[PDB]
Amino acid sequence: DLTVSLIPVSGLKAGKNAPSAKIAKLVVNSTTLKEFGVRGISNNVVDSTGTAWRVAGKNTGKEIGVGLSSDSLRRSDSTEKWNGVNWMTFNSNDTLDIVLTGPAQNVTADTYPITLDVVGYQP
Amino acid sequence: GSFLPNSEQQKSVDIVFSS
């Protein structure tokens, strides 16, 4: 199987944020599987691989754009299909960054939930 | 290649932006 940790970044501040500001670290380890696929899960996924999506603040309902960082995307081993559904794959025993996507975002102070689905892949 | 359906996991966390 896989052991997955998703770690929120400390010290995030409301207001204008840097482009691609890091917001969480994804850690996927395995003793048995060489690779994994990952997709964001929300009410508004915005690309065909599910590696960028939008999430709503708990207290305000305001939306922010989140996703894998461009560096993280460039570490993908491949994009594979599971019965037709795209999953970008990555080496296990790696970390990836989840960021604020696109140009600089102005973020209202709030708590924003993020959900990912991770699946093992044998190449 | 193949996906291992039984290995699929969902993980969720809260991201907090403070004033």
Automatic annotation (TrEMBL), chain A:
Keyword terms of this UniProt record: Signal
Limits of the Saf-pilin pilus formation protein domain: 1-123
Protein name: Outer membrane protein
Biological source species: Salmonella typhimurium (strain LT2 / SGSC1412 / ATCC 700720)
Gene symbol of the encoding locus: safA
Residues of the whole record sequence present: 48 to 170 of 170
TrEMBL record, chain B:
Taxonomy, superkingdom: Bacteria
Protein name, per record: Outer membrane protein
